[PDB]
Amino acid sequence: TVPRIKAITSKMRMPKSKGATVLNL
Amino acid sequence: EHLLEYAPQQIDISNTRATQSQFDTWYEAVQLAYDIGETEMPTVMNGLMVWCIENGTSPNINGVWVMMDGDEQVEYPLKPIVENAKPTLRQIMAHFSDVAEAYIEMRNKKEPYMPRYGLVRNLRDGSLARYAFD
Amino acid sequence: TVPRIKAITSKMRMPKSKGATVLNLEHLLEYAPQQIDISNTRATQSQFDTWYEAVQLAYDIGETEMPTVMNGLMVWCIENGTSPNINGVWVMMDGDEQVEYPLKPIVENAKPTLRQIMAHFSDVAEAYIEMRNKKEPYMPRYGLVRNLRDGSLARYAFDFYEVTSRTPVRAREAHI
Amino acid sequence: EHLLEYAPQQIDISNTRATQSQFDTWYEAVQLAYDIGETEMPTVMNGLMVWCIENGTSPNINGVWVM
């Protein structure tokens, strides 16, 4: 078959303070 | 003495076909910017020269070009094909001018196949519809 | 015997990068895709997939009730062409009275344009007018402006007609 | 199945004739802005379509039309 492109996804970088999240998603 | 011992062909010097180095920089930068390696990358160019027959060598940069596979399509970004082709896309794809007129000769005998550049110019014979693409 | 001419063959010079070939010639011969699935007039399956899901959403009409809408769209887009104003409305007959719909989420989601998205319906549209011509004379509205004059060529002359290689040569002059 | 059971006419979809709703908003706003009610307003439109035959559908806005 044909070679499909493997698109990567840059992460939706959620901000953090010291190791935990900062939003109640 | 060396002038008489010197017969180079039109296709290896002229302006329409870009140089071997311009095609060498282009093809390595496309193999890189698709993350598709050797023995899997020449299958892609079988899809490129069929697409560039039809829609010509002037797309928008942000657009996409398709390639049939079975029944469903795939897609690819047109950004690293017209941004690496340093003269232009026309003068880089002119390396494929030998195979393309041998592709349509294959395609005309099964069914009538005018390329899309021919239908705009309104050519009217399926035998001259072999030398008129972009 | 007679001296036959020895015809030489200039090579079918396949392009190369650094010493190896650039095409899979085995798969090239096992590869015959059609005009309609690659060309520029018909937009891609993904461009029609984003368009149709964004229309189903922005009308709040679900599956098994949404394909009835597209029976009204391809009849309207035959007549008034694929260039309306964005704020306007398009109608759809039902019994005797009309309905209406907003033209805003049909030309704002069609990412190439409306013409290249409705060109998926180029197969059904010329099969719609062939149905319609036999009951009564039916020139589409794009034909009446261009002043075509026969009800049998009034099948291939609407706005969003893709010009494939199956078009008769009289019809491909009618667009250009 | 419904596509084959669907034959609408040119005049009810096309661009030249505006929609029934565009004519519905227009006719109610003319009946209002003349203070001429029902059974007296359709006599006015007998005068409008005779005038709009002759002077066309492009007058100045401030002008008048006779009957």
Q: How far is B121 from chain A (nearest CA, A)?
A: 32
Of residues B35, B69, B77, nearest to A2 (C-beta): B69
Q: Determined by which method?
A: cryo-EM
Beta strand pairing status for C97-102 and C89-94? antiparallel
D neighbours by CB contacts (3+ pairs under 8 Å): C
Which tokens sit at B119? 């239908």
Distance in angstroms (rounded) separating the CA atoms of residues B120 and B122:
5
- Tell which A residues from 1 to 25 touch B, by Cβ distance under 8 Å: 1-6
Compute the 3-state secondary structure of chain D and give helix, strand, coil in percent, each to the nearest 5. Answer: 45, 0, 55
Cβ of C79 and D6 within 8 Å? no
In chain C, the DSSP E strands lie at 89-94, 97-102
Query: How many CB atoms sit inside 10 A of residue D17's CB?
Result: 12
Please, what sign has the CA dihedral across residues D53, D56, D57, D61?
Answer: negative
Q: How far is D27 from chain C (nearest CA, A)?
A: 17
Residues of B in contact with C18 (CB under 8 A): 24
Cβ of C98 and D14 within 8 Å? no
> This structure's resolution (angstroms)?
4.1
Which tokens sit at C88? 């306007």
Q: Are B106 and B113 in contact (CB under 8 A)?
A: no
Chains C and B, touching by 3 or more CB pairs within 8 angstroms: yes
Q: What torsion do the CA atoms of D3, D6, D12, D16 make, to the nearest 10 degrees? A: 40
* Residues sharing a CB contact under 8 Å with residue C94, sequence separation 6 or more, in sequence order: none
CA C14 and chain centroid, separation: 34
User: ∠ CA C31-C33-C37 to the nearest 5 degrees?
Assistant: 150
C172 half-sphere exposure, CB direction, 13 A CA radius:
17
Distance in angstroms (rounded) separating the CA atoms of residues B118 and C176:
13
Of residues D3, D4, D13, nearest to C93 (C-beta): D13
Q: Are C105 and C89 in contact (CB under 8 A)?
A: no
Distance in angstroms (rounded) separating the CA atoms of residues B41 and B46:
9
Of residues B27, B66, B124, nearest to C169 (C-beta): B124
